[PDB]
Design an enzyme around this catalytic site. Structure first.
Site, mmCIF file in Angstrom:
data_model
loop_
_atom_site.group_PDB
_atom_site.id
_atom_site.type_symbol
_atom_site.label_atom_id
_atom_site.label_comp_id
_atom_site.label_asym_id
_atom_site.label_seq_id
_atom_site.Cartn_x
_atom_site.Cartn_y
_atom_site.Cartn_z
ATOM 1 N N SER A 35 -12.069 15.940 -1.994
ATOM 2 C CA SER A 35 -11.302 16.826 -2.853
ATOM 3 C C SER A 35 -11.909 18.229 -2.848
ATOM 4 O O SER A 35 -13.124 18.412 -2.707
ATOM 5 C CB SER A 35 -11.252 16.261 -4.280
ATOM 6 O OG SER A 35 -10.630 17.166 -5.173
ATOM 7 N N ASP A 47 -5.534 -3.694 -3.145
ATOM 8 C CA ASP A 47 -6.819 -3.033 -3.373
ATOM 9 C C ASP A 47 -7.218 -2.227 -2.138
ATOM 10 O O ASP A 47 -7.750 -2.787 -1.173
ATOM 11 C CB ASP A 47 -7.883 -4.077 -3.689
ATOM 12 C CG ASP A 47 -9.235 -3.472 -3.977
ATOM 13 O OD1 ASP A 47 -9.298 -2.252 -4.163
ATOM 14 O OD2 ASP A 47 -10.222 -4.225 -4.013
#
Length: 330
Positions: free
Chosen positions: A199, A35
């Site tokens: 992004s 994770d």
């Protein structure tokens, strides 16, 4: 040193991925959910409340000659999905894919919430976010990657998650046969303890690319792709019959649909998520309403590049002094 381990989807939807991990002496092998959005290595154990164990493999520290109680240390964690667990702490030897750390904090669960009990395939979590998020008190503990870093050939790990197929976590090296083209690296902020990056934009299907900054986290422990409501609305508007359902808890679409791809920007590069990766199947057994793999982050407080996005790429988690992320097509 290096390590290399295969990671395998837990079910036919790729809801999560499990990776075998050796703990203790002699080794006890548990299948953990790696994770990158959390920083605790915790396991089902011989200390876990018996009614809360239902098929998981447990770590028994009393059978490990290298286990030592970390005196006074406790842990307690709550995840974005509302699940939780808590317990005490041992140090022990932990190996992943041939890479060994001695003195790793192994957090032994005394209690787990229902969703962990109900998932017999996940024996615990192995956190790979920054150690500043580790919940052990009163002395915070380091992640497996943090402990191994100095010994690694290169201070990196890579995630190569499969679509309906096994993949690989590598530690200490970048497998240049595992991706196509080049790796584009992008800046990371560690201020929230996450692999947080920005992004450069998105496209829906064959549509034109929209340049827009989207700050979010690379999180292998989250199934879906969570993005701003504007972006998610633009995606689902291209799917006939798709709608946001408050009763179901997100966007649903006719299972008869063919979904468009979704592209996200990494610098000047582009990662394409095929439409099929966005299909999470019937909302309930036998239903013709299917659950979407791209959902709004509006209620989370952060955008999350979860498995839906990450499994379309070869992802480098660069833990050099200034960390960065790298993405390649594959």
């Amino acid at each position: 040193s290096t390590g290399s381990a295969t990671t395998t989807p837990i079910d036919s939807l790729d809801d999560a991925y499990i990776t075998p991990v050796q703990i203790g002496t002699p080794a006890q092998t548990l299948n953990l959910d790696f994770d990158t959005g959390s920083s605790d290595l915790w396991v089902f154990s011989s200390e876990t409340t018996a009614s809360e164990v239902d098929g998981q493999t447990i770590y028994t520290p009393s059978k490990s000659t290298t286990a030592k109680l970390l005196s006074g240390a406790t842990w307690s964690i709550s995840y974005g999905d509302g699940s939780s667990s808590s317990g005490d702490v041992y140090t022990d030897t932990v190996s992943v894919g041939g890479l060994t750390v001695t003195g790793q904090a192994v957090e032994s669960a005394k209690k787990v919430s229902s969703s962990f009990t109900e998932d017999s395939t996940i024996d615990g979590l192995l956190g790979l976010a920054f150690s500043t998020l580790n919940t052990v008190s009163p002395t915070q503990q380091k992640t497996f990657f943090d402990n191994a870093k100095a010994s690694l050939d290169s201070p990196v790990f890579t995630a190569d998650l499969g679509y309906h197929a096994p993949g690989t976590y590598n530690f200490g090296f970048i497998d240049t046969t595992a991706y196509t083209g080049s790796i584009t690296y992008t800046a990371v902020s560690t201020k929230q303890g996450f692999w947080e990056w920005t992004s450069t934009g998105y496209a829906v299907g064959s549509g034109t690319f929209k340049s827009t900054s989207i700050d979010g986290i690379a999180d292998t422990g989250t199934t879906l792709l969570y993005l701003p409501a504007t972006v998610v609305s633009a995606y689902w508007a291209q799917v006939s019959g798709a709608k946001s359902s408050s009763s179901v808890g997100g966007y649903v679409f006719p299972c008869s649909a063919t979904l468009p791809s979704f592209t996200f920007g990494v610098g000047s590069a582009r990662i394409v998520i095929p439409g099929d990766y966005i299909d999470f199947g019937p909302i309930s057994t036998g239903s013709s309403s299917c659950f979407g793999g791209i959902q709004s982050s509006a209620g989370i407080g952060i955008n999350i590049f979860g498995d839906v996005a990450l499994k379309a790429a070869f992802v480098v988690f660069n833990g050099a002094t200034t960390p960065t992320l790298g993405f390649a097509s594959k």
